[PDB]
Symmetry: C5
Subunit: 103 residues, 5 copies
């Protein structure tokens, strides 16, 4: 298995690493129909989403999608510095695939 977020990100098409090195500036969460998603922004101006679950996701990703949103909320609330994001860049906003944080 991959040993780092960069190694993991390299396994996928339509991905890149953003080096954030910052806490989340804003957290947005929606339960509106067809828009059940989270949006985060950074003071850099960058915006990312956790996508609405759909056919681009396999069954094993369902719990992982819910965990990622859990992680983003608590990261926001604790002002925890995010190191890197691996994102799909074929979506607007870019879609989060993986997150790393270092201490």
């Amino acid at each position: 298995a991959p040993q780092t977020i960069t190694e993991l990100c390299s396994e996928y098409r339509n991905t890149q690493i953003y080096t954030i090195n910052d806490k989340i500036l804003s957290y947005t969460e929606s339960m509106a129909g067809k828009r059940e998603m989270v949006i985060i922004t950074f003071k850099s101006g960058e915006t990312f989403q956790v996508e609405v679950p759909g056919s681009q996701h396999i069954d094993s990703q369902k719990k992982a999608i819910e965990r990622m949103k859990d992680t983003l909320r608590i990261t926001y609330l604790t002002e925890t510095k995010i190191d890197k994001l691996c994102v799909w860049n074929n979506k607007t906003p870019n879609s989060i695939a993986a997150i790393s944080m270092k201490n």
Copy 2:
């Protein structure tokens, strides 16, 4: 996908944005039959609910409804300042569709 709560809110009928810019004043949670819901208030006097799950909700909203109540409780407990709420105004109290918080 939308990049902000205001963009998201505009996609729906019977919605508006409330600019809260404040922590939650009170948190109310009910497990009583047919009233399984959360109500929050602000010192402004405004009151909002997360609705009881019903036929106005699609399957993808079920986990999202539970998440929103999770978010409101921890937001209350941490005295986290809410930025905006996107609400359905065809309900009393107005019904929460999305929340944003900024730091």
Copy 3:
């Protein structure tokens, strides 16, 4: 929908409001068979339960019962002041229907 805990409580038979205005003194949690429940007490001497799930509960209440126990544990741990409880008084200890907290 109701706008306050008192309004909500008034919709049900065999209920009343206790005004607590205090943190939880003790928290008890059981996983013993047929006694899967939580008991809380206050320095006033009042004791309350979240009942074991049973036929007095409809399907919509199952997640709500689990949320209520989640709420009591974290409220206990954070020493959060409870404002009111709406309880069913036809049970010993009185059984929690709703909880409010204010800040």
Copy 4:
């Protein structure tokens, strides 16, 4: 229903109350097959488990077993003082039936 941990404990064969009056010294969690369990110890030298789910458990106990492990982890992390444990003494380590904490 019982109003205290001692009342509840008394309802069961093969149980006893340990008065702990202390925080958890160590927390151990296993996801190893057939050993999906939690072990806690105290500076007293006592060791307790939450048992692996098995045929000695009824369906209503499944969520309660998961809740108890959730409770022990957060109690450990917050250094919360445990008051009493109701344990089954026909297991090694003794198996947790109920927990109480007072403030």
Copy 5:
């Protein structure tokens, strides 16, 4: 049942104990398809994973896998010192079977 992480670890083939005695340096979480996993590192240079769920896991381990990832995230966030890890050494990075923390 085992009374310590070392006793538990000894029940399994392809395992060993790492004595960590340190907080987590980095936390990485992925929701990418077929890589739904967590990776942690320590300043020692050691790297560990919670494996993607697969046929090497029995049904009883599914909830335990999810709990282990929950534990690693909160442990990271709270800077909680890990005592030992029991890991399967037939995987790269080594795969976490059990964790202990002491206070």
